[PDB]
Design an enzyme around this catalytic site. Structure first.
Site, PDB file in Angstrom:
ATOM      1  N   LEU A 112       0.847  -1.272  -0.117  1.00 17.01           N
ATOM      2  CA  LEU A 112       0.138   0.125   0.003  1.00 17.01           C
ATOM      3  C   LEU A 112       0.806   1.293  -0.097  1.00 17.01           C
ATOM      4  CD1 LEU A 112      -2.842  -1.053   2.197  1.00 17.01           C
ATOM      5  CD2 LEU A 112      -2.921  -1.033  -0.164  1.00 17.01           C
TER       6      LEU A 112
ATOM      7  N   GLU B 270       5.246   3.050   1.769  1.00 17.83           N
ATOM      8  CA  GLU B 270       6.073   3.066   2.572  1.00 17.83           C
ATOM      9  C   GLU B 270       5.956   4.339   3.312  1.00 17.83           C
ATOM     10  N   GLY B 271       6.375   4.559   4.609  1.00 18.57           N
ATOM     11  CA  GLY B 271       6.617   5.430   5.445  1.00 18.57           C
ATOM     12  C   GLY B 271       8.167   5.842   5.857  1.00 18.57           C
ATOM     13  N   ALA B 272       8.442   6.430   6.759  1.00 15.01           N
ATOM     14  CA  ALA B 272       9.680   6.725   7.084  1.00 15.01           C
ATOM     15  C   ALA B 272      10.626   5.348   7.255  1.00 15.01           C
ATOM     16  CB  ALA B 272       9.943   7.271   8.581  1.00 15.01           C
ATOM     17  N   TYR B 273      10.019   4.510   8.381  1.00 12.89           N
ATOM     18  CA  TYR B 273      10.397   3.038   8.649  1.00 12.89           C
ATOM     19  C   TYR B 273       9.429   2.142   8.404  1.00 12.89           C
ATOM     20  N   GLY B 274       9.614   0.991   7.532  1.00 13.96           N
ATOM     21  CA  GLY B 274       8.728  -0.006   7.412  1.00 13.96           C
ATOM     22  C   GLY B 274       7.652   0.188   6.103  1.00 13.96           C
ATOM     23  N   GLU B 275       6.808  -0.610   6.061  1.00 14.12           N
ATOM     24  CA  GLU B 275       5.863  -0.767   5.030  1.00 14.12           C
ATOM     25  C   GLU B 275       4.370  -1.107   5.273  1.00 14.12           C
ATOM     26  OE1 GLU B 275       6.071  -4.347   1.920  1.00 14.12           O
ATOM     27  OE2 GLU B 275       7.488  -2.766   1.027  1.00 14.12           O
TER      28      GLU B 275
ATOM     29  N   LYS C 256       1.195  -2.748   9.027  1.00  9.74           N
ATOM     30  CA  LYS C 256       2.441  -2.011   8.909  1.00  9.74           C
ATOM     31  C   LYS C 256       3.346  -3.107   9.550  1.00  9.74           C
ATOM     32  CE  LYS C 256       4.985   1.507  11.183  1.00  9.74           C
ATOM     33  NZ  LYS C 256       4.825   3.121  11.125  1.00  9.74           N
TER      34      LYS C 256
ATOM     35  N   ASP D 100       2.935  15.411  11.603  1.00  8.64           N
ATOM     36  CA  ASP D 100       3.333  15.064  10.138  1.00  8.64           C
ATOM     37  C   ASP D 100       2.025  14.984   9.243  1.00  8.64           C
ATOM     38  OD1 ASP D 100       5.153  14.876   7.876  1.00  8.64           O
ATOM     39  OD2 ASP D 100       5.190  12.881   8.145  1.00  8.64           O
TER      40      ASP D 100
HETATM   41  C1  LIG Z   1      -0.169   6.575   5.660  1.00  2.00           C
HETATM   42  C2  LIG Z   1       0.859   5.614   5.345  1.00  2.00           C
HETATM   43  C3  LIG Z   1       2.008   6.026   4.760  1.00  2.00           C
HETATM   44  C4  LIG Z   1       2.667   4.713   3.759  1.00  2.00           C
HETATM   45  C5  LIG Z   1       1.284   4.452   3.228  1.00  2.00           C
HETATM   46  N1  LIG Z   1       0.364   4.484   4.162  1.00  2.00           N
HETATM   47  C6  LIG Z   1      -0.912   3.767   4.316  1.00  2.00           C
HETATM   48  C7  LIG Z   1      -1.652   3.453   5.291  1.00  2.00           C
HETATM   49  C8  LIG Z   1      -1.324   3.594   6.615  1.00  2.00           C
HETATM   50  N2  LIG Z   1      -1.006   3.540   7.815  1.00  2.00           N
HETATM   51  C9  LIG Z   1      -3.026   2.867   4.726  1.00  2.00           C
HETATM   52  C10 LIG Z   1      -4.088   2.111   5.242  1.00  2.00           C
HETATM   53  N3  LIG Z   1      -4.308   2.124   6.579  1.00  2.00           N
HETATM   54  N4  LIG Z   1      -5.121   1.829   4.599  1.00  2.00           N
HETATM   55  C11 LIG Z   1      -4.728   2.049   3.263  1.00  2.00           C
HETATM   56  N5  LIG Z   1      -3.935   2.665   2.481  1.00  2.00           N
HETATM   57  C12 LIG Z   1      -2.946   2.896   3.462  1.00  2.00           C
HETATM   58  N6  LIG Z   1      -1.545   3.546   3.086  1.00  2.00           N
HETATM   59  C13 LIG Z   1      -1.493   4.017   1.656  1.00  2.00           C
END
Ligand SMILES: C[C@@H]1CCCN1c1c(C#N)c2c(N)ncnc2n1C
Length: 257
Positions: free
Chosen positions: A11, A13-18, A34, A117
């Site tokens: 879906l 990736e953020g700072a750390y993890g996927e 996550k 953020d």
């Molecule tokens: C917001 C983060 C940042 C990286 C991508 N993310 C996320 C989620 C989180 N948490 C998330 C979720 N719950 N349902 C559907 N799509 C999501 N995506 C893209």
């Protein structure tokens, strides 16, 4: 791929993890998970969260190094993907999202939590386009036992950060989150961010402080929402509009298509 759940696809990736979409082989229930490996903190904050405009936490599981944070799936994807570059989106859609974003931020502030953020990547949509504030990686407690603590860590995303976070040793949490909400509103109404960062050395920021609203992105924004952005993107955080006062704003209360 974890107990009863299959990890279908990435879906993001953020700072750390996927983050992965997880479908239950039995029930067919789809959630978001996550995958990580500070994190004791995120989990603790995630368990406080109970509001229609915040991503719900379902529970966690450590399997060796890897931690799995099961949370509500936002099947509409991100606000980021609804912002047409250089255009934004229809003003009534932007107003509706803004109302939901305020509902979410009031909720967080009310339980003494700052997100730190806020930006369109961290603002997700359910199947009815209800906005959900997501990703509690940088979130922190700014109020405990009815006592506020000032923040001192510089964090967030430069185009979204409030100027006091670059200038002050310590600052109040709530006006930082209000500021980033004003950059999100700008992005929704103009499809562009107004400056790389709110510093003295940034010509677009200087331009705004000198009220050159004949320039982009401001010239694309109607006078009513722009009067609100004038009260939100105020350099002195103690002069900056508060959410109670945003809720009294003329554009905020304007009936729209
Ligand atoms: C917001 C983060 C940042 C990286 C991508 N993310 C996320 C989620 C989180 N948490 C998330 C979720 N719950 N349902 C559907 N799509 C999501 N995506 C893209």
């Amino acid at each position: 791929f974890v107990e009863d759940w299959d990890l279908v696809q990435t879906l993001g990736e953020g700072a750390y993890g996927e983050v992965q979409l997880a479908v239950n082989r039995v029930t067919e229930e789809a959630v978001a998970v996550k995958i990580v490996d500070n994190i004791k903190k995120e989990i603790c904050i995630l368990k406080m969260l109970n509001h229609e405009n915040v991503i719900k936490f379902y529970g966690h599981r450590r399997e060796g190094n890897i931690q799995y944070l099961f949370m509500e799936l936002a099947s509409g994807g991100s606000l980021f993907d609804r912002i047409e570059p250089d255009i934004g989106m229809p003003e009534p859609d932007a107003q509706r999202f803004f109302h939901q974003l305020m509902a979410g931020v009031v909720y967080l502030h009310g339980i003494g939590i700052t997100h730190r953020d806020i930006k369109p990547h961290n603002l997700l949509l359910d199947e009815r386009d209800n906005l959900k504030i997501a990703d509690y990686s940088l979130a922190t407690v700014f109020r405990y036992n009815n006592r506020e603590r000032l923040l001192n860590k510089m964090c967030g995303t430069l185009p979204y950060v409030a100027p006091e976070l670059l200038k002050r040793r310590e600052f109040h949490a709530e006006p930082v989150d209000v500021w980033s909400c004003g950059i999100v509103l700008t992005a929704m109404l103009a499809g562009e961010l107004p400056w790389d960062q709110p510093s003295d050395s940034c010509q677009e920021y200087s331009d705004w402080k000198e009220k050159k609203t004949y320039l982009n992105p401001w010239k694309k924004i109607d006078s009513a929402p722009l009067a609100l952005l004038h009260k939100i993107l105020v350099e002195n955080p103690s002069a900056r509009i508060t959410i109670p006062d945003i809720k009294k704003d003329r554009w905020y209360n304007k009936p729209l298509k």
